[PDB]
Design a binder for these strands. Structure first.
Ligand code: K
Ligand code: K
Ligand code: K
Ligand code: K
Ligand code: K
Ligand code: K
Ligand code: K
Ligand code: K
Ligand code: K
Ligand code: MG
Ligand code: MG
Ligand code: MG
Ligand code: MG
Ligand code: MG
Ligand code: MG
Ligand code: MG
Ligand code: MG
Ligand code: MG
Ligand code: MG
Ligand code: MG
Ligand code: ZN
Lengths: 59, 174, 147, 206, 38
RNA sequence: CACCUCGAUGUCGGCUCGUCGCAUCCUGGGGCUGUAGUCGGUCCCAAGGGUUGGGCUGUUCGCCCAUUAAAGCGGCACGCGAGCUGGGUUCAGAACGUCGUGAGACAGUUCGGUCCCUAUCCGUCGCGGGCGUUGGAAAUUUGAGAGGAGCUGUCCUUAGUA
RNA sequence: UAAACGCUGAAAGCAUCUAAGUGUGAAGCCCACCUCAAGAUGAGAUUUCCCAUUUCUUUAAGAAAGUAAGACCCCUGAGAG
């Protein structure tokens, strides 16, 4: 799951570590299993999560 | 006290052509080209050329001096050229030039034959003296060194080919 | 629930990328290329299935060797006969057979198994700026930010 | 310069001044250039050459078709010669023994006579063990190596099939050439049994 | 050429330099003083 | 020292076969010389090849004889005994000197004294079968890679010149 | 290329074989000479030969059954074993 999430995060312009830190800041608790599932299946949903993580990181 | 800072003049009608690199010099003797460093800046006056380095780092000081020396050598060679004078000493040691070919008899069972490149010439004012004359200091020195190494001087009796005037220590072999 | 996605052979589309090695350090070029060949850049990555993309390396003759590696990095190989050790410097390999240089570097970074060797076959190295795989419609892959 | 022939046998000849020298008689029925290989079509320069006309019943349609270009009968032996001037050769051209002149220095290639399974003593010229003094070690190939490797290093030479190998003898001399009989007399001896294929080429060393 | 770990000048003419990462002592006066570090 | 091996890891020398290290014996290159020349001395680079036939002794070693360009030093279970030998170590016999009252023993010698195994696996040297190499066939081929080879004397001439 | 020797050349007005630049240099290293070699699964290349058949299933890189080019079985043998 970590590997797949990393690939998806890179495609969204972010590293896995940055994405997880951003999600923690944004209060997102979705775990790595669900994150990898979204990355493979629901690219749009994963992109929304990545946008929120980047926003939290910027703040 | 710095070769890199010292200015270089353009005597007579020596001309210089510029380019991103690969500076060229022309004059009475001929043409030359060297790919100087991209960091040393060359400033050109009507007849004077100077070199500048970006900073005072070890590398910049070193390369500044080297480029200035190289450019100065090119100019002096284009104007007057360079000559290496060799004086062979021996009972039957002799040299003779047929055009660009130098034939040396220095005691070997066979004569030694040397060929100058188009940029160099051999004078041979006498059978015991040779002068390598050219435009490029590097090539002149290299050819002169090769001629000397054919049969370098020896200490016991002074025999061999010598650079004219070079000190050659001599041993009192019993 | 056992719902993790698992890729299948042949369902996933493998693209074709062109990588320019001009003045890129050998190791860094090999690392990015190895990740691409394994498919680590795609969310569908499945360790037990090949899912990476083909890679074409151009200008292999211009790969970069920092330090004295051009003269000091030595590649050894043993014929398995007594005293049958042979060596060749990395610089000599770059000059004469650059394809072998890149391929050896990438082999070292791929897994040493059936899947790894099959993934390696998807590599294609060419000294020079032209390749014969125009039919595959490869796309440039900028790596300046990946190294 | 090169040609293919058959090792007829061995004899001797008296040269001028009466010296006696051993010669090998090699017959070479005019060989035929069957194909010319170029950098464009094959990536290297060489000429394919056929020798020893073959009965039709012994040939195949593919073989007959291949020689059809040269417009000759089927050939038993076919070999490629390199390091020659392609301009001077063309499909259908013949090569005769007169290519070589007496006194030419040549390399002769053949297939060594087959000795079959042979022991190490004969095959590799190894030393025997003592034949007396209680010795029970006569014609064996020696030790197999040190203990430490727990194995035998490669090239530990042992018994096996001997001969039948491609061997070249360098810098032989063309004693004589008989064009009418298509014969070349080469000083010395050359590998291969009688009636075997032989390849004469201009010595590379020269 | 004296190849030794310790290379030092022996007369005032001896000069210490580095070539190809090796320490060397070169003396135009006495060639016996010629030393390399090794 | 006593960590593996005492429900056994055969122990010297020699023979057969070698392979490797370079701290190089010869050959190759070079610096310095208290290097005139011929010889050399010392040091540096160099492991490609080569580096013996005998007398004595079980011997290694060593001495000697005669050669060689040289007669290198070492590792590999002081390489190699399911490859050989068995001269020595060392069994049982017997004897000498010596020790012991003695049986016996060595702080020592001498003569004589059983060396087993049909190779399953890997490994090594050769030779086939199967399939693959993407229609089925007959030939000729490039060379990724690999192996082999790699030694050296004397004489003549240059010149009795330097 | 090794040791070694340089040429030009500054750092360091000099000096300096090195930092840039450039060369000579060993029975050694890569070739050169000989042999093996595309199971080099990366299985390469060229020349030549055969020709798109029949039946049934299924759109099947389907199945089997006559063959073509060719090979082999079998038989006479050696230059091979
Ligand atoms: K034990
Ligand atoms: K040894
Ligand atoms: K010396
Ligand atoms: K050696
Ligand atoms: K003896
Ligand atoms: K035994
Ligand atoms: K054993
Ligand atoms: K086993
Ligand atoms: K093939
Ligand atoms: Mg013998
Ligand atoms: Mg092992
Ligand atoms: Mg001292
Ligand atoms: Mg204890
Ligand atoms: Mg046991
Ligand atoms: Mg050494
Ligand atoms: Mg006797
Ligand atoms: Mg032993
Ligand atoms: Mg054993
Ligand atoms: Mg008593
Ligand atoms: Mg008896
Ligand atoms: Zn001094």
């Amino acid at each position: 799951w970590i590997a797949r999430i990393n690939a998806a995060a890179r495609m969204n312009g972010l590293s896995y570590s940055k994405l997880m830190h951003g999600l923690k800041l944004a209060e997102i608790d979705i775990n790595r299993k669900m994150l990898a599932d979204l990355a493979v299946n629901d690219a749009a949903a994963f992109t929304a999560l990545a946008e929120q993580a980047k926003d939290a990181l910027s703040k | 006290s710095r070769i890199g800072n010292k200015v270089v003049v353009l005597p007579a009608g020596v001309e210089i052509k510029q380019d991103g690199n690969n500076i060229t010099v022309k004059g009475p003797k001929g043409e030359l080209t060297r790919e100087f460093s991209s960091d040393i800046k060359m400033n050109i006056e009507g007849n004077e050329v100077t070199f500048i380095r970006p900073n005072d780092s070890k590398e910049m000081k070193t390369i500044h001096g080297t480029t200035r020396a190289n450019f100065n050598n090119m100019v002096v060679g284009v104007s007057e050229g360079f000559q290496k004078a060799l004086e062979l000493i021996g009972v039957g040691y002799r040299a003779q030039v047929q055009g660009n070919k130098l034939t040396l008899n220095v005691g070997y069972s066979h004569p030694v034959e040397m060929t100058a490149p188009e940029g160099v010439t051999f004078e041979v004012p006498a059978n015991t003296q040779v002068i390598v004359k050219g435009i490029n200091k590097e090539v002149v020195g290299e050819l002169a060194a090769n001629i000397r190494g054919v049969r370098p001087p020896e200490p016991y009796k002074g025999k061999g080919i010598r650079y004219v005037g070079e000190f050659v220590r001599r041993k009192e072999g019993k | 629930m056992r719902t993790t996605y698992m890729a299948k052979a042949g369902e996933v589309e493998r693209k074709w990328y062109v990588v320019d090695a001009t003045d890129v350090p050998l190791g860094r070029l090999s690392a990015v290329v190895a990740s691409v060949l394994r498919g680590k850049n795609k969310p569908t990555f499945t360790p037990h299935v090949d899912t990476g993309d083909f890679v074409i390396v151009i200008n292999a003759d211009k790969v970069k060797l920092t330090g004295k590696k051009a003269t000091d990095k030595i590649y050894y190989r043993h014929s398995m006969y007594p005293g049958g050790l042979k060596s060749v410097t990395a610089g000599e390999l770059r000059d004469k057979n650059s394809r072998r240089l890149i391929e050896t570097s990438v082999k070292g970074m791929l897994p040493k198994n059936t899947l790894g060797r099959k993934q390696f076959t998807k590599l294609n190295v060419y000294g020079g700026a032209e390749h014969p795989h125009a039919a595959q419609q490869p796309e440039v892959l900028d790596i300046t930010n990946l190294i | 310069k090169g040609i293919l022939g058959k090792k007829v046998g061995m004899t001797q000849i008296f040269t001028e001044s009466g010296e006696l020298i051993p010669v090998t008689v090699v017959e070479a029925t005019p060989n035929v250039v069957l194909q010319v290989k170029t950098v464009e079509t094959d990536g290297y320069e060489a000429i394919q050459v056929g020798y020893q006309d073959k009965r039709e019943v012994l040939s195949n349609k593919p073989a007959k078709g291949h020689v059809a270009k040269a417009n000759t009968a089927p050939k038993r032996f076919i070999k490629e010669f390199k390091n020659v001037e392609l301009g001077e050769y063309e499909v259908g051209k013949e090569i005769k023994v007169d290519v070589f002149q007496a006194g030419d220095v040549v390399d002769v290639t053949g297939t060594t006579k087959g000795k079959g399974f042979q022991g190490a003593i004969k095959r590799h010229g190894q030393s025997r063990g003592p034949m007396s003094h209680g010795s029970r070690y006569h014609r064996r190939p020696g030790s197999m190596g040190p203990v430490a490797p727990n194995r035998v290093f490669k090239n530990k030479r042992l018994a096996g099939r001997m001969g039948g190998d491609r061997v070249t003898i360098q810098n032989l001399e063309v004693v004589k050439v008989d064009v009418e009989r298509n014969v070349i007399l080469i000083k010395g001896n050359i590998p291969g049994a009688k009636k075997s294929l032989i390849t004469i080429k201009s010595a590379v060393k020269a | 050429m004296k190849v030794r770990p310790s290379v030092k000048p022996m007369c005032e003419h001896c000069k210490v330099i580095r070539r190809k990462g090796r320490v060397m002592v070169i003396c135009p006066a006495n060639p016996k003083h010629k030393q390399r570090q090794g």
